[PDB]
From a paper:
Factor XI (FXI) has an important role in thrombin generation in the amplification phase of the coagulation process. Inhibition of activated FXI (FXIa) should decrease thrombin generation in the amplification phase, but not in the initiation phase, and thus yield an antithrombotic and profibrinolytic effect with minimal risk of bleeding (see reviews). The mutated residues in this construct (FXIa CD) are located at least 16 Å from the catalytic residue Ser195 and the alterations are therefore not anticipated to impact ligand binding in the active site.
Several of the fragment hit compounds were only weakly basic, such as aminopyridines and aminoquinolines, and neutral compounds, such as chloroquinolinones and the known p-chlorophenyltetrazoles, were also identified. Two prioritized fragment hits, 6-chloro-3,4-dihydro-1H-quinolin-2-one and 4-methylquinolin-6-amine are shown in Fig. 5. The crystal structures of compounds 5 and 6 in complex with FXIa were solved to 2.0 and 1.7 Å resolution, respectively, and the fragments could be unambiguously placed in the electron density maps. The two fragments display distinct binding modes as depicted in Fig. 5. Fragment 5 displayed a FXIa IC50 of 140 μM. The chloro atom is directed almost perpendicular to the aromatic ring of Tyr228 and is located at a distance of 3.8 Å to the closest carbon atom of the phenyl ring. This chloro atom replaces a highly conserved water molecule and its position is similar to the chloro atom in chloro-phenyl containing P1s of FXIa, thrombin and FXa inhibitor. The chloroquinolinone compound 5 picks up an additional interaction with FXIa, i.e. the quinolinone NH group forms a 2.7 Å hydrogen bond with the backbone carbonyl of Gly218. Notably, the chloroquinolinone is slightly more potent than benzamidine, compound 7, despite the fact that the former is neutral and does not form polar interactions with Asp189.
Numbering used by the authors:
A (entry chain A), B (entry chain A): 16 to 37, 37A, 37B, 37C, 37D, 38 to 48, 51 to 59, 59A, ...
C-alpha cells in the first residue's frame, strides 16, 4: 500500500495473508474471508502455482513477524479460478480458495459480507484498500498491515485514464487524481472494503494498475458484485 | 553489493550464505569456508541470535532461488564470537561457525586460504567484495551473487574519512574516492578476497560503513591477518 498507515490490530478481520512455501516461505497475495471454508482473492496470484499444497493461509495477522514455523495456518484444498480468466488487465481476476479446515470466527477473524445487487446504485463514500504490499513500485513486503482510504472513480473516468485498455463494468476503479495513495505489488487479491450503513462490504478485489499511486492512474479492482452468482455457484457442495 | 555484477557460478566457491529460519527462513549474512568444519564470518551477524539451531549454511550457491525446503545445508553446532567483540564499529567483528558435519570439497565449494603475516607488506591490487546484499541502502536481498572489484585504501586515508571513529590496525578499508562500489546491508560476514601470485586470500571480512557506496566513505572490513592466531586457537580440538 502506498501512502497508507499502519492498521489497528484486527480492524480488517476478513483480511488474510496468502503465503507460498516454494522455494522458501513468503507472502504471495492478500485475500478475504467470505465463508467458513472460503477465501476470495485474485486469479492472477496463482501464476506458476502448480499445486495448492504449497499454499498457506494466515488469518488474524497484523504483522508478518507473527508468522513463524510454529504459527497455525489454513491449508488449501482447492484453487478455483474463473474459467474466463486470462490476465488481470482483461478482467475476471477472481479466484476462490477452499480451505482444508473451517475457520472458527472470532474478533480477529470473521467473514466480510458480499455486496448486494441492490447496492449497485449505492455511492460508497468510505472505501479502504489494505495489505502488506510495497510502499513503492520497487520495494518489499511490509511487516505491518497498511490501510489507505481511497475514493471510487466512475467507470467513465477510469476509462479515460487507461486509453489502451477496456475498463469493463466487471471492474471498479479507485484513486486520487493527483495519485499518492494506492495498492501496489503484494496487495493483489486483498479487499477493497467499503463501509455502508454500518456494515462492511467486499466491493472490490485488488487487481492491477499502471505503477503504484501515480497521478491519473486509478487502481483497478475486480467488481465483486458482478460475480456474486459465480461465487454462489462455486461455493456449493458437490 | 552496490555497483557490482552477477558472478559466474562457483567463481567464489568459499562464499556461503548464512540463513536464519526464525521466524521464517531468510538470508542473514555472508561467510567464507576456511576449513572442513569452519566458516569465518562477522560477529555482528548474530545480534539477537540466541541459539545456533536456527542457523543454516548453504554452500555452492549462485542464486538464492536454488535454496528450497529440499536443498541440502550445513547445520551449526557452535557459534564462536571474539570475546572482545562489542560492535562492528569498534572492531573485533569476527566469528567462527563450527558446522555439524564436514564439507566435502568440490569445484563449487572449497576453502579460501588465510592471509600470511609475511604478506602484510603485500600491496593487494586485485580485491573483490561479494554477496547477496542490497544494491542500495534501502533495498532487498539479491537473487544472484554479486561481485565488485574494490581498491584497498590505507588506514591513514580511511581514518580521515571516519573522523568520529577509531580506524585501528585490526581493520582494513576499501573503496573508491567517488564511491559507487561497496558492500551493503546483507553482505556482512562475507569475504574481501584478494588474488595474489595466482592464489586467493581472505584479506577481510565485510563489516561496516556509513551508508553504502557513498563518496569518501570506504567500506570497513575486519583485517583477517590480525586474527590468524585467534582462528588457530579457536579451531583446535577440545
Ligand atoms: O504494481 C501494481 C500491482 C498491483 C496494483 C493493484 C492496484 Cl489496485 C493498483 C496498482 C497496482 N500496481
Ligand atoms: O549498511 C551497510 C552495511 C554493511 C556495510 C559493509 C561495508 Cl564493508 C560497507 C558498507 C556497509 N553498509
Amino acid at each position: 500500500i502506498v501512502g497508507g498507515t499502519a492498521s489497528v490490530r484486527g480492524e480488517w478481520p476478513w483480511q488474510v495473508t496468502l503465503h507460498t512455501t516454494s522455494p522458501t516461505q513468503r507472502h504471495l497475495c492478500g485475500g478475504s474471508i467470505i465463508g467458513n471454508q472460503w477465501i476470495l482473492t485474485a486469479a492472477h496470484c496463482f501464476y506458476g502455482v502448480e499445486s495448492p499444497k504449497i499454499l498457506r493461509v494466515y488469518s488474524g495477522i497484523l504483522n508478518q513477524a507473527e508468522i513463524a514455523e510454529d504459527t497455525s495456518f489454513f491449508g488449501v484444498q482447492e484453487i478455483i479460478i474463473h474459467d474466463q480468466y486470462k490476465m488481470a488487465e482483461s478482467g475476471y481476476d477472481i479466484a476462490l480458495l477452499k480451505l482444508e479446515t473451517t475457520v472458527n470466527y472470532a474478533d480477529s477473524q470473521r467473514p466480510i459480507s458480499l455486496p448486494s445487487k441492490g447496492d449497485r446504485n449505492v455511492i460508497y463514500t468510505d472505501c479502504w484498500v489494505t495489505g502488506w504490499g510495497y510502499r513503492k513500485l520497487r520495494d518489499k513486503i511490509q511487516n505491518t498491515l497498511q490501510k489507505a482510504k481511497i475514493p471510487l472513480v466512475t467507470n467513465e473516468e477510469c476509462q479515460k485514464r487507461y486509453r489502451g485498455h477496456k475498463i469493463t463494468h466487471k471492474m471498479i476503479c479507485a484513486g486520487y487524481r493527483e495519485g499518492g495513495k494506492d495498492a501496489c505489488k503484494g496487495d493483489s487479491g486483498g479487499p477493497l472494503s467499503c463501509k455502508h450503513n454500518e456494515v462492511w462490504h467486499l466491493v472490490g478485489i485488488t487487481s492491477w494498475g499502471e505503477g503504484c499511486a501515480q497521478r491519473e492512474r486509478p487502481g483497478v479492482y475486480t467488481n465483486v458484485v458482478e460475480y456474486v452468482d459465480w461465487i454462489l455457484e462455486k461455493t456449493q457442495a458437490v
